[PDB]
Amino acid sequence: DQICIGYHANNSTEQVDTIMEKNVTVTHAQDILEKTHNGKLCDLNGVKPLILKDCSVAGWLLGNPMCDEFIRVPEWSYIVERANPANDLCYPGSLNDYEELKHLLSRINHFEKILIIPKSSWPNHETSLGVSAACPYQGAPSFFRNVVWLIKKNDAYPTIKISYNNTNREDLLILWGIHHSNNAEEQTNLYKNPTTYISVGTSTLNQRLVPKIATRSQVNGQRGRMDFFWTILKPDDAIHFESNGNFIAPEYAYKIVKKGDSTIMKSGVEYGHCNTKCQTPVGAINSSMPFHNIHPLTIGECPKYVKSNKLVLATGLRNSPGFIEGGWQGMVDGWYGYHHSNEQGSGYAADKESTQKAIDGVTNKVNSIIDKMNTQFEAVGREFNNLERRIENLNKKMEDGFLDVWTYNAELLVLMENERTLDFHDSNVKNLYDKVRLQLRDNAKELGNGCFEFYHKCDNECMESVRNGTYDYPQYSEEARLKRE
Amino acid sequence: DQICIGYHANNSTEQVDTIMEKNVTVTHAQDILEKTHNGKLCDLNGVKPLILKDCSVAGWLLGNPMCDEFIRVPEWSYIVERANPANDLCYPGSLNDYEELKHLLSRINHFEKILIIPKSSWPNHETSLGVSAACPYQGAPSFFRNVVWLIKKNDAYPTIKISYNNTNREDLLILWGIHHSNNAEEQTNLYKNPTTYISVGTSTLNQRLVPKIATRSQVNGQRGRMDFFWTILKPDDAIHFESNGNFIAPEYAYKIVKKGDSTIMKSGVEYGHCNTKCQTPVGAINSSMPFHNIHPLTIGECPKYVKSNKLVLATGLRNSGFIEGGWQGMVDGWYGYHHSNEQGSGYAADKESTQKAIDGVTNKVNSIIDKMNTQFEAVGREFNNLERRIENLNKKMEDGFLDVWTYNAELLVLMENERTLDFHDSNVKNLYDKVRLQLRDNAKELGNGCFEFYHKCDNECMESVRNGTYDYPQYSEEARLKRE
């Protein structure tokens, strides 16, 4: 006749590492690292991204003939660009502050193309001959759709003086450019005048562009270049152009309303008609876990990126194949409990109160570590050019330093807390064993294995009497007194 | 006749959370989060700020007529500027490298205006016509006080060639500028010469400026523009100017002595006459706590900013089981005993056990506070509209450290509070063990944290049990015959 107190055992193969012990198989565990993604590019917080297909932001904006004339998506959360975009700037050249303009255009709440300077405005210049082979539409020479390459008319290029007053209530993005000639003959042939200039003026802008006529390498079959420039014209301000040649004049402009900032994501995954709080170039993370290892360049409210394959928190008990030699595989209905083997039968019992008290606390342990990382803001990727490598290395030092801080702190926290959890489980059993110690002072002997040697007989009902804390010690005290022999 | 053990209880309503348990009332606690500021702007480590009031750095350096002429103070710890300063470049234009100038001027050990090029130095040029409505003073057109807008004299503008050798043993901040005419007629009207230049050269400078005669939009009623430039002439170098028009010449310069940095603060709070090691745009912080939630953009040896409303550390016992709860009747300690005797009944406290615990939890709180390193850091936003990528980097940095310090501080608190509550429980159970070992069969294990005396213990006996000097041989026979 004896009563026993032990812990639970199941068939789990999951192991956890603690600060002092490694590879400790436990009954229950919880990974706080997310490794699952959608494999698709989703909407970010309800807004659809801008997916440019093998075209760059410059190509799309300036109107490369090989790009969708109108995306007519007025709003986007992020811009999706392929790694090495194909079409780009068909006529060789450059766009000023490109990387800044891209940051400006990463998240837009209104985008609408408008016609600010119609070709009718150029009565003494040729608007139809400004085309090239480097800019093709269906094999045919063409040019950027949103600008106008003006050339001489009647061997004469009269000085242009045109102004546009932004009557709209929205800011305007206005793009224009300068054509660099190749020799003096080419200069006079397109623009009668040999010495040329472009002057651009707004309330904040004061620009003097002058063409550079030199020998250059051939790119897309052209040795000349075209440098482009942009400005943001505020409501009720006016832009003032003046030139006598080499002018790539604006024809269309863009109404921008910008309330937020994002980044240009470089990815090739397809739009999945989904929504997500966190987008990575490889797929979307819908998770609440504090840490992830999917991809560094996330956008949105994301878990912290760590260099870890697994971060498993123990939520259970040491599994089995110290007074309590091991756990009971037969106690399938509890975490802490009792065992009896009286004259009538032998059975396994579970301590509901002690069990729930621990299940609540251990889940509170996981939820605390999970939910205290409520610090989730917005994020960005890569945005620096070839002569900005020092700032790029700055961003990399930062990302790596944060990588090291989160990974050390997360891996150590799991190790420190898992040691405490397993200890917390050990202390719970010992207090239960001390509960029956005080209930059966001399009416039972200390066997030492977590079991108690009943001098007197207990029925299955007396066993539930030691359990339930409903046992009378003087009821059987004299029987134990005689059992001493 | 019985003896018991029990922990102290208060009227405290303070609640702490642990890693496994939430909303646990305690008798004592401490918040390691600073939440208060003095509501004023103060001297930082003894040095008064420079409060440009509705003036920008540009309009104070150049002489805007609506800004303060004199530099009252030769040194400052930080600059305070309003959000959208009203008096800035009154004539429309620009100041080169303005953010870097601002950063340079943000903390200065010595600033002193000096006249470098007297207005007498310009005999064949006009020194008095160079005003504008855009820069008004007392109802009349004026201009920046620290430079000169030279104009033609007798319909002629002789090519200027002037040099200034720095003989001041300290660096000099020198400013000049270029005037952008509006049309070829304006140009000859102010400077007879239609094509003009400005050549500035030092030991390190090689600059050539040319006006941009072009149609611009009216700002402050002018379509002209004035671009200003600057430089730091070293203590034995000379600056050489040459121009034949459009020259905004330097008249005054500043002797600079720079030994530290500390960004421009944007606040509208008034200057209280106080000192602080830590200044925010809303107020100053006088604290030794590790963490705070006052403002992101501090200056000085400040606590770490976190996104937390409170960081409370439990330093006491759980407030009102095996001990059946706490004793609100206990007044003179944290761990105590209960005499229940026919001679007398009362409460007593373990003097050493309590003091060992209050010293430890005090060491726990003091350790968390004292291990924080405070480095002088000036957090400010110093990037213009075409510098938004670098601003994003700074944001990511600020935001990352915020997320680290908040996560650590929140989890440190939860974790150490679970340990603090179990540390009180272990110290209590050790007192139960001391009494249990001294009286095995002489006392009875009631199980509710109390002992049942078979023997009748004097109030002198009761102290001996606490003193750890009970003699089981004294009346072990009493218990033998009592067990019936």
Next chain:
Amino acid sequence: DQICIGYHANNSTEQVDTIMEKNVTVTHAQDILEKTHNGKLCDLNGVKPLILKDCSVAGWLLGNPMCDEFIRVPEWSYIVERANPANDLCYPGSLNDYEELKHLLSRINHFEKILIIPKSSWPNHETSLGVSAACPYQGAPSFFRNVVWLIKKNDAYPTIKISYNNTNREDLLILWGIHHSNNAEEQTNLYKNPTTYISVGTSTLNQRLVPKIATRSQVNGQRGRMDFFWTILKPDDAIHFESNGNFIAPEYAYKIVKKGDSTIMKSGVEYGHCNTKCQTPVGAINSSMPFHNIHPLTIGECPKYVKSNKLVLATGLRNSGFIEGGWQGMVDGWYGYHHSNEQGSGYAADKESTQKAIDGVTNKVNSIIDKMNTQFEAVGREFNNLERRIENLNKKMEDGFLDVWTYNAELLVLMENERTLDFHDSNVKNLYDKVRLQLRDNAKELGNGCFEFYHKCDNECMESVRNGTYDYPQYSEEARLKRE
């Protein structure tokens, strides 16, 4: 008559602090902070540094006569410049994007100087008169060796139009330059061409340079200046120069193959002919420790820099559940017993319990060391005077991380030290409870961790209780009357 459960004591003078207790003398400890360096500049992962000595990256690159040697290292891992290199640009001027060039050049896999434009290519110009006293060689006017200063021939300077196609499969770093003369006479007496230009064109480059004839200050005896420029010619592109005069033309160029990044180190210590994974400006760190306090500016796979001077982890026990403890006699374990009978008295140790403690504390120490993730990094200052806002961002980032690692590492030591000392206390209590449970009735507990055998037990039964093989029915209640 007595057996006792006690712990080890030694003669260690090492103290560690804990979250609740300070200056706790322990038996064994481990400092996880590295403080020692060999005092030499070493190779990084088997690659030699490039130790420019009193020469700048521009002097070495452009071929300063005073620079001691031509190109000698074909691959490097980092560059070593002296704080203020003495040589640099012997003729006064500048080099465009010098700090971005120094970044690219910081870690180069392949580097080879090649002759791209021989002097035979300048028939109608003079390639021999392009010298200056500023570049002095051996007491004689000289000049940069990798670039040629072209001068008129027969009072004529015919326009240069020249193209170099990159026929190599490696990229080519090409440097050219422009000379700013001082007055219109010097311009004619050197280039016989009053208005001059320099156009440089590649597949990506489209430059126009025009001299600035202007009064400047004397540097190294020259009021003139030379501004140099560089570009990277890709493997099948060609560069095209055109120039009326003032051309400092490329003679030599460098084959570049770049496959990783580093930074430039400012140090004066010398090569030790050693190899390391981690390099500071004062020496090299060969350590697995997670934290170090040597220098902030490290290149390589380094530990985290912290401000602390001691991070001592505790691996043993307190030094003078036995109340006194402090058994200086025990030498072969941490936990053990002590016997007392007619044969004699001596100390014994528990092998199974002690070993699991040593396994545990060392696995903790290893876990703290081993869980640190080290990335290759290069901490250096790469910003100029008009970049001090970026420098501050760097400083804030560095200083922000220093504060993060210092606090967390300090609390880690403190928290885990106190938990380890207390877990050892649980282990000696596990031994006492095992002994007390077996001696159910035949023995009394004295209170000091010891047990009084009423029925005196000799050497033979001491091993049975120790081994857990104690036979309770074998000898029992022999002398109940010993208690009387």
